[PDB]
Design a protein around this ligand. Sequence first.
Ligand SMILES: Nc1nc2c(ncn2[C@@H]2O[C@H](COP(=O)(O)OP(=O)(O)OP(=O)(O)O)[C@@H](O)[C@H]2O)c(=O)[nH]1
Ligand SMILES: Nc1nc2c(ncn2[C@@H]2O[C@H](COP(=O)(O)OP(=O)(O)O)[C@@H](O)[C@H]2O)c(=O)[nH]1
Ligand SMILES: [Ca+2]
Ligand SMILES: [Ca+2]
Ligand SMILES: [Cl-]
Ligand SMILES: [Mg+2]
Lengths: 68, 421, 440
Amino acid sequence: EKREHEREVIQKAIEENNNFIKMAKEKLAQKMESNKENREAHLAAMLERLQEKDKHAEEVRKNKELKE
Amino acid sequence: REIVHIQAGQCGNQIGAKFWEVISDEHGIDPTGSYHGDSDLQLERINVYYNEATGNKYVPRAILVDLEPGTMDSVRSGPFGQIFRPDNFVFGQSGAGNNWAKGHYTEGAELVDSVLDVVRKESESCDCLQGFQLTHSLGGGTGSGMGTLLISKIREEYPDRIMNTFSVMPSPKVSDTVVEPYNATLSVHQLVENTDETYCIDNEALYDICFRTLKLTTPTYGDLNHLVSATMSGVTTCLRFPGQLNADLRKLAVNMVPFPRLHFFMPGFAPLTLTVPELTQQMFDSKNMMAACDPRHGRYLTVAAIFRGRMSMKEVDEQMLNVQNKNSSYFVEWIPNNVKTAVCDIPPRGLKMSATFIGNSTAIQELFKRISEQFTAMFRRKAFLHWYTGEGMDEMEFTEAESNMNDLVSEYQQYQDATAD
Amino acid sequence: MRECISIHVGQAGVQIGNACWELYCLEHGIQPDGQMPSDKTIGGGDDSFNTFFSETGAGKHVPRAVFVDLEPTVIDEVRTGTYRQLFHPEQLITGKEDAANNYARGHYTIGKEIIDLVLDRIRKLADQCTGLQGFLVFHSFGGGTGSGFTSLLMERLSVDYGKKSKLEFSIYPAPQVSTAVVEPYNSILTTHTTLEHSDCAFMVDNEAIYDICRRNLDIERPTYTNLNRLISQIVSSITASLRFDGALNVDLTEFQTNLVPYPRIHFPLATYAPVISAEKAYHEQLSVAEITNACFEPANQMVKCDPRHGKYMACCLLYRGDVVPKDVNAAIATIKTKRSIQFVDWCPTGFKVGINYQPPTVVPGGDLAKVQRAVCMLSNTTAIAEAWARLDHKFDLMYAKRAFVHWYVGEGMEEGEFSEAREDMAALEKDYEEVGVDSV
Ligand SMILES: Nc1nc2c(ncn2[C@@H]2O[C@H](COP(=O)(O)OP(=O)(O)OP(=O)(O)O)[C@@H](O)[C@H]2O)c(=O)[nH]1
Ligand SMILES: Nc1nc2c(ncn2[C@@H]2O[C@H](COP(=O)(O)OP(=O)(O)O)[C@@H](O)[C@H]2O)c(=O)[nH]1
Ligand SMILES: [Ca+2]
Ligand SMILES: [Ca+2]
Ligand SMILES: [Cl-]
Ligand SMILES: [Mg+2]
């Protein structure tokens, strides 16, 4: 019974170390993915606003063109 | 690392030429592009503003833009005119007639792609571009309208780079052109959205300095641009020489801009033509600000101070702590340690010591209030609007620019009123 | 066997590494070209100094160290400086664009582009070890690289080496030499993210070092060089047990056993003595009693706080030089009867003592006097939470208005990370209160 308990203790140490490594890996993957998504979203919104500005400039030149 | 410099319009090109003359002298570059300095400190970060070409020649990473050839022809004939890359001159013939709409939507829109070709060519040969600095005025047509259009286009192509402007504010004291409040409000509307940091070079302040302080009865544009060049050298010292603090545009922006829209800086210089206490006191003096605002009418969000010359760093630290402790009411208490100080051993030309001040103060709302008052006085009577509606613009655009600038002022007021408790 | 790998991250980490490795070479008789005439085993060995230096067949002793920075100007001075021959080029890793004092850029935007290369070079060092004991990570709290890239590296190191020991030397921000307003943000973010992955962290308050230099060395305006030479003396005191042998030499891990009662309570307060100018040291021999007394004067601490208004959970004295146990015991006896040393009721009040016989060395042209004996005290005191309190207060002042937060959000961070890190810091302050409360 003592031998069985010894095997159990060492297996539990291995399991806890492996689970630490696993949860660290997964949290880091989640953080990097969420961060990539957020930064790409901000850049996309910025470029969309700039394209709306370009569209408005097109509209302005049109409005001048039909003023003649 | 590398900064790309663009100067647009008459004012933009004149103050840019003076800037290049001043910093070429500081870095030991002669008008032919050859180095003849005496300190390796001059060359350590020379690559920030200069490309290196064959024969160990140094060529400004500079792009010269205008809708008329005159000012750029005079630049090419100026003292350092031959130092610029000839292909980096991009000019049209139509002119802008002091019309923001012509600069932004029509004539400038026709010219902007050939400017972008040169911008792209300069950026592609950058080891690691930090971003761009633009010199222009807000009162004219080319600088104002086409500069803001260029800012938007460049931001479209380089969204993760820092956009920095030196923007000259109009004043009845200097120019009589009546549509300048329109041009300036339309420009500020763009800058609030598409620049990361903007040095407000207020022509009102330059005039008042030359008149009251320098005793120049009839100040010329030369006299104003002398102040502008000294201030620009001051504010770019940390970018141009080895150093710890605000050594690149992004670190400067991170230190100076607590909220994205509040990025309009009040520059100051001392001495206006000796001891460290005198330098510090004068650099915080309203009479030394290049924006016509009294800082004691508002609160400082962030400040950067640059001391140049051989002086006691202990005394510099003591005096900066002294001014902060003795004027704490004027620094927001919810941004701890918001004053950063750099010291460069190399003084500007002709001086043994100098100090340059960069303040993000809520008092800049006095500048924007002045511009808004002059704008509204004309807009409520719809004066001269046909110059703009004739280019395809809508009155709604004027209303929106007015609204946005009023919002900016109210935001400065909100953070001036904010309290820690 | 028992190798330690040093990783120096950012400007502060790299320059402190510069000072530390120069001091190590002086302490071991290693020339700038890596040669060590006194080492008679060429190309290998299991001497004590081999915990920190590997050996080439040509006789060069190479630091088990990686230097990492996201911009190249600081490591370029290593590449061109005095000890350039010491390192292999692959140990000095640089990017082109720094993190601009932005934790988010150090951890995510820029850091992600160099992290795999850094881990690869660290693996190359680890494969040379027959019995790696762990890592020593040098970094600032305030810098973008020092905070964010350090946090990224620590997470990745936990993944690549499990529970293998990781110690920090962390530069705590001080307004006298700080370069960023957002340094409180960066400090709290990196402390939160690193807390689970660090086994022991030695905080160095730049203000404390600054004041020690001004007061004890009469330096009017201390530079990073002054600060780093002092800091390297403290680091050398801490690593001397790993780098030298002796019969009274107690291992750092054995000190660590006493210094970390709870995994989160792993921030020892370091105190170092003596810090004296050569002009004052001349004809003034400082005794074991004098330097041991100096260990309990707050003015000599690496972190500003008042242990006299806190409780001790551990007290370690690390002597180097001409020191014997009889004199140590006499001085400790004197101090107990005379000082405000209050322990928590669940810990023994003894002092753990280690003595390394090899005397302290000073870098030529430095400010520190060469002394015959010195001591570094590592104590676990609840007072260290004062530094967390100051940092958290500055954080709260700025975050209540969301000042500068847009710079982080723009790089992909969320406000929730700010609030989560701040809650972790609040829980840490609570932990330090709880460990100090008496039992019932
Ligand atoms: N003691 C000491 N502190 C330093 C040193 N260099 C920088 N620091 C401190 O570290 C903080 C700034 O962080 P840095 O290490 O310079 O920034 P970084 O790691 O290069 O990160 P980046 O933002 O990408 O440049 C400030 O608090 C400085 O006071 C140094 O050599 N010695
Ligand atoms: N400080 C300074 N201000 C100028 C200069 N030139 C023009 N300004 C101002 O700039 C405004 C007109 O802008 P301008 O550049 O001349 O028009 P543009 O060439 O079409 O862009 C007016 O308010 C002028 O007072 C100059 O050389 N120095
Ligand atoms: Ca004009
Ligand atoms: Ca050997
Ligand atoms: Cl020393
Ligand atoms: Mg750095």
